[PDB]
């Protein structure tokens, strides 16, 4: 499902998904190392729960046209993840469909 | 910190029904809203629904028709009931604790809001093949 | 002697241009007196009767013909009356309507599949089916107010031809009729503005020491009873949606402006109201009230009819809203009317003569005063 | 006689439909165009009405 | 060089029935439609003539 993009170590990663928004949005972005359980790295566009550093943020949701976008600030050789995003919107059906995500590679 | 440990029959034949279950350690079962979360190979999760204390219940649509989730109160267990398993259902299951909060982009009275949902604790999951 | 004559507009604003056109610049009347003279009549007693005036005639008169002046030249839009196409727009997980239409182009021969949005009010189902009309074609005709007319009020002053002359009460606690005893002399009238509203008046003036109520027959349910505050209250009003405009050619130089995709969220219209200084007045208007009927006064919801009665009826910028106002007639938050807003307009019961009001784009932001109420009468 | 028994084709208030009308007419306000059933007012031809 | 010959069809005094009719025109009152032949009066884009 995920594309890929690629970045070497300390460089950072610009990563989008999902659809434009058409009214407020509400973006849960998830993080998926390969063997792993996925985890949440941000829910509301910019609030991160305990335990994810604040080299990652993104979009926020006050914009109509644009699209969900996740950068990661000097991206690190554990950063290697599939990042999804899951898209709450005001104007759309609730999406229970995970959108398509992007493989971060870290190019170390 | 909770662990959710997940547990079923890993391999089911075509029309089967399978049952998953998550045993609920460090909380309880009523605590929190429950969800789970398939994964196929290959492809990108899929929410299949949501269950809760209070009546708060809601499913996928695509799936609603073959599927029950519950919390069982006594054994502190969150569970999953699929029937009409096919091979399209094969997939890597997640039992979850979902938490919530709610964006305003409008009036409060006129309802100018919504409900939004994440996935905080994700248990081990479980792998479902399909013969 | 009391006469009956034909007053003229004067103004004293001249600040704005000839380009913005407003409907009430006629642009042949004169500048006021920027400093006009008030004489005082020592020792008069002049008998004023608010009812059986005929300055209201007058200036009721004018105004319709202006409004109709204005409007006839524009672009008529009975070649949309045609079978509407329509489906919900998606105000998803109500009162907007996504229609498409078969036109005429400018070549006779050919037609062309475009699309509007509509508010619910101006649109009714023909069929169980999705085939909708616009709600005026079945009885009328309906023009396109023109697209660079400002129907913004501006106060009108009204000055008697040489020969007549107009007198005041300035008696502060005069109500509609009776000898006033103290009486001068003016050129003319002070400026009026001519705002448009029913169950509430806005943005005139307000009485000076107590709140006066005026009715012709106070014994009269039927009658309209006219009650001007002493104190204005605010009322902050909005279309909170960015609205855009699509220009549709309808015809050879002939163009429909349709409410074009909405931007953003989709929101209702509302005024809001300070509970507290709504419920001071209220307290206030009774209380005055009380002093004629010697009951407990109480205050009621609109009861009925069609839009233009059961709501607060007015124009801000352009736009036409239509008020819920059951929270009022009837803690220290602010009281939030939900509006409605259509575009299909039959200004001063003339039914049969409609108007379309076309889209303003971006969003819109009122703040106007309450100045009194227009209150009718259904024990102890 | 004198009194015809005419039918129209008429545009109603929505301009992409029409109904079979009725109407009857007296003789001297109606023209055959052909020698088969088929009329007009007489006024067409000339002007306005 | 600069006359066009066109043909029309045009509105006769009975509404239902249409004319097949021609004009003759400079070229500096019609305006190519398409890259066939087919053209509009110059001003019928703009306003009434
Ligand atoms: C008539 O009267 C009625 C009322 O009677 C008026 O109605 C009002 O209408 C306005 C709309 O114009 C509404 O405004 C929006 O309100 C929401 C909600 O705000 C409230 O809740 C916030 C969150 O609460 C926090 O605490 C609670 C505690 O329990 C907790 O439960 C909750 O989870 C959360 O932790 C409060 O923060 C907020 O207070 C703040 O804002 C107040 C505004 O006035 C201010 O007074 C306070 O001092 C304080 O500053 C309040 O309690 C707002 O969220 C919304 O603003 C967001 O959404 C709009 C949508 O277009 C967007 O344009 C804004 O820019 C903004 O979006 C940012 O924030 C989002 C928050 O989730 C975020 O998701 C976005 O991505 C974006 O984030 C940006 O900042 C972050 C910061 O880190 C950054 O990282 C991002 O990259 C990005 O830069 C509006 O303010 C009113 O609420 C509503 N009134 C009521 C009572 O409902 C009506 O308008 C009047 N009509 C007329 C004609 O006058
Ligand atoms: C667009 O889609 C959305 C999404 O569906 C629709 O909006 C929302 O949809 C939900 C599900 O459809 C609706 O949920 C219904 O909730 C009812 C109970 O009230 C809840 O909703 C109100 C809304 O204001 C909340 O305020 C209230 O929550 C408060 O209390 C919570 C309690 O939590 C405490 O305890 C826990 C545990 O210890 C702690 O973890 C917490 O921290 C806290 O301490 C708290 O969590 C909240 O934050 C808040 O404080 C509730 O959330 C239920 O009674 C309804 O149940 C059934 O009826 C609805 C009817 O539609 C069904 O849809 C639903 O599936 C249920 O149906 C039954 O029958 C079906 C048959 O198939 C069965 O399958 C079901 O199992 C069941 O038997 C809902 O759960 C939500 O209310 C709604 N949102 C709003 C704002 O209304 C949206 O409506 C739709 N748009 C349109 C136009 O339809
Ligand atoms: C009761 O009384 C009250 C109090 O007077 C009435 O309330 C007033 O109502 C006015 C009309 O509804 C409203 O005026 C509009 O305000 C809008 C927003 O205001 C902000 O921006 C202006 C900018 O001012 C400068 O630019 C303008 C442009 O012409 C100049 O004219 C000014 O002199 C300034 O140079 C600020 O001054 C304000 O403080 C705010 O920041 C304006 O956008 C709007 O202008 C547009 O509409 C006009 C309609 O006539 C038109 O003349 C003007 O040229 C603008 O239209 C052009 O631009 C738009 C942009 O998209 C375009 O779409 C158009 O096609 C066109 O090109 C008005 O100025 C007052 O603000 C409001 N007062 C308050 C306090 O809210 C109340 O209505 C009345 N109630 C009743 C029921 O009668
Ligand atoms: C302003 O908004 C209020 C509500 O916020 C509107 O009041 C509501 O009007 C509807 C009219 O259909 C009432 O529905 C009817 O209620 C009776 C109750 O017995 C029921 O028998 C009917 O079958 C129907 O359901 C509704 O109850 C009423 N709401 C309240 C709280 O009274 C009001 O009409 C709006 N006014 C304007 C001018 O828009
Ligand atoms: C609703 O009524 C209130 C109260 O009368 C209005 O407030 C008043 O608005 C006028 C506008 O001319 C203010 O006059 C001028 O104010 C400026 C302020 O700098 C001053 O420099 C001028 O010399 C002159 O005084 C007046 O002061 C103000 N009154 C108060 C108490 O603030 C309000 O504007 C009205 N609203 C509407 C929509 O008409
Ligand atoms: C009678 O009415 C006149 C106005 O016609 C009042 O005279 C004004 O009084 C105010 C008081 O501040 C002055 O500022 C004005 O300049 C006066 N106007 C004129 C035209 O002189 C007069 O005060 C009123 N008298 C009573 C008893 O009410
Ligand atoms: C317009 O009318 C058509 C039917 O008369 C509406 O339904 C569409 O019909 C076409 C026929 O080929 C289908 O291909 C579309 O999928 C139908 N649409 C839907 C939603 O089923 C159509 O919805 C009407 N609405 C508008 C705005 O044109
Ligand atoms: C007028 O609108 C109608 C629909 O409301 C159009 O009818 C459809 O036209 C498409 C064109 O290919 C056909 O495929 C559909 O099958 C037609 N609908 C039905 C129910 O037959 C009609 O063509 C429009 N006229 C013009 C000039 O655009
Ligand atoms: C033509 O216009 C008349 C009004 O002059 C319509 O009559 C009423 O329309 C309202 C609109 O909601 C209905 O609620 C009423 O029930 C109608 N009256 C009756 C007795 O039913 C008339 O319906 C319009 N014609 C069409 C075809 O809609
Ligand atoms: C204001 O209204 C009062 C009545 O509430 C007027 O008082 C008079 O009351 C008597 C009672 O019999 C009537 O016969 C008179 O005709 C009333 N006067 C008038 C003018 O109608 C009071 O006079 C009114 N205001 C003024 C300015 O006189
Ligand atoms: C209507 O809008 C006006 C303008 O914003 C509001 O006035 C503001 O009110 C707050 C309340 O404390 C003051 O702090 C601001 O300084 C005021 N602004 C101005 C320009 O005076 C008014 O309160 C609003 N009315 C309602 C009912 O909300
Ligand atoms: C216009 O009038 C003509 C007749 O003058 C109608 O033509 C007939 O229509 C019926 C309808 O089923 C057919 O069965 C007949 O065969 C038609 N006559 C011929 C000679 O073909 C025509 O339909 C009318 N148009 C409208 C819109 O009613
Ligand atoms: C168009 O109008 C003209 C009159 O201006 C018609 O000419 C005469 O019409 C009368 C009507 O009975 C006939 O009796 C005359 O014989 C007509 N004149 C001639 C020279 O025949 C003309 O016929 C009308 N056109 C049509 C098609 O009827
Ligand atoms: C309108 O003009 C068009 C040509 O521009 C006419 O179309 C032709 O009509 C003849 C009549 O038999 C056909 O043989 C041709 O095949 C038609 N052309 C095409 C491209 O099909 C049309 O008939 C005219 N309409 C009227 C009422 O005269
Ligand atoms: C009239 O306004 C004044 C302003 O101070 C206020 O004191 C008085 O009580 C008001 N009277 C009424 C009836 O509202
Ligand atoms: C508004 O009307 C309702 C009708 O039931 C009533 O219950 C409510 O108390 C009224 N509110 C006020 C402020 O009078």
């Not at chain 1, 509301?44 to 046209?65: A, E, K, L, V």
């Not at chain 3, 009861?303 to 233009?308: A, N, Q």
């Not at chain 3, 809203?321 to 009281?335: D, M, V």
């Amino acid at each position: 499902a995920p594309t890929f993009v690629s970045v070497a170590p300390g460089q950072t990663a610009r990563i989008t998904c999902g659809e434009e928004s058409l009214g407020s949005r509400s973006v849960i972005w998830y993080q998926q190392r390969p063997g792993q359980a996925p985890s949440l790295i941000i829910y509301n566009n910019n609030d991160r729960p305990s335990g994810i550093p604040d080299r990652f943020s993104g979009s926020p949701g006050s914009t109509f046209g644009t699209t969900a976008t996740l950068t990661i600030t000097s991206v690190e050789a554990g950063d290697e993840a599939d990042y999804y995003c899951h898209i709450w919107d005001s104007r759309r059906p609730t999406n229970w469909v995970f959108g398509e995500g992007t493989t971060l590679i870290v190019l170390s | 910190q909770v662990h959710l440990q997940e547990s079923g029959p890993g391999l089911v034949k075509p029309s089967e029904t399978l049952s998953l279950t998550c045993n609920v350690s460090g909380t309880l079962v009523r605590d929190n809203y429950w969800s789970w979360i398939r994964q196929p190979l290959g492809k990108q999760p899929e929410w299949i629904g949501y269950v809760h204390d209070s009546g708060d219940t809601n499913y996928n649509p695509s799936l609603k028709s073959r599927v029950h989730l519950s919390l069982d109160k006594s054994k502190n267990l969150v569970s999953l009931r699929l029937t009409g398993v096919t091979a399209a259902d094969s997939a890597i299951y997640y039992c979850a604790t979902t938490k919530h909060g709610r964006r305003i982009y409008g009036v409060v009275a006129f309802k100018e809001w919504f409900t939004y949902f994440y996935m905080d604790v994700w248990g081990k999951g479980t792998s479902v093949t399909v013969s | 002697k009391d006469a009956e004559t034909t007053l003229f507009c004067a103004s004293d604003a001249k600040a704005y241009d000839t380009e913005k056109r407003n409907v009430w610049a006629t642009h042949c009347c004169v500048p006021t007196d920027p400093n006009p003279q008030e004489i005082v009549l020592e020792n008069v007693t002049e008998n004023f009767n608010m009812w059986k005036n005929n300055m209201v005639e007058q200036m009721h008169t004018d105004i319709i013909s202006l409004w109709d002046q204005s409007l006839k030249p524009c672009v008529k839009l009975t070649p949309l009356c045609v079978t509407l196409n329509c489906t919900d727009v998606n105000a998803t997980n109500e009162e907007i309507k996504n229609c498409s239409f078969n036109i005429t182009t400018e070549l006779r021969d050919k037609k062309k599949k475009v699309y509007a949005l509509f508010y619910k009010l101006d649109v009714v189902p023909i069929d169980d089916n999705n085939s909708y009309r616009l709600i005026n074609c079945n009885t009328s005709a309906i023009t396109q107010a023109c697209p660079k007319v400002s129907f913004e009020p501006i106060p009108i002053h009204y000055c008697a031809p040489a020969g007549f002359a107009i007198l005041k009460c300035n008696d502060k606690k005069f109500n509609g009729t009776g000898p006033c005893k103290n009486v001068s002399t003016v050129q003319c009238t002070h400026g009026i503005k001519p705002v448009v509203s029913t169950q509430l008046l806005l943005n005139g003036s307000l009485a000076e020491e107590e709140i006066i109520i005026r009715s012709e027959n106070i014994t009269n349910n039927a009658k309209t009873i006219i009650v001007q505050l002493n104190e204005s209250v605010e009322i902050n009003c909005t279309r909170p949606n960015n609205n855009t405009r699509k220009s549709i050619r309808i015809g050879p130089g002939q163009w429909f402006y349709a409410t074009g995709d909405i931007i953003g969220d989709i929101r209702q219209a509302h005024c809001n109201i300070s509970r507290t200084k709504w419920n001071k007045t209220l307290q206030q208007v009774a209380k005055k009230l009380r002093e004629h009927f010697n009951k407990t006064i109480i205050f009621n919801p609109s009861s009925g009819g069609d839009l233009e009665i059961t709501t607060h009826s007015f124009n801000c910028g352009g736009e036409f809203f239509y008020c819920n106002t059951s929270e009022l007639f009837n803690t220290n938050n602010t009281i939030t009317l939900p509006c409605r807003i259509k575009q299909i307009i039959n200004m001063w019961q003339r039914v049969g003569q409609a108007m379309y009001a076309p889209p303003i784009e971006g969003k819109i932001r009122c703040t106007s005063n309450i100045t009194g109420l227009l209150l009718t009468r259904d024990n102890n």
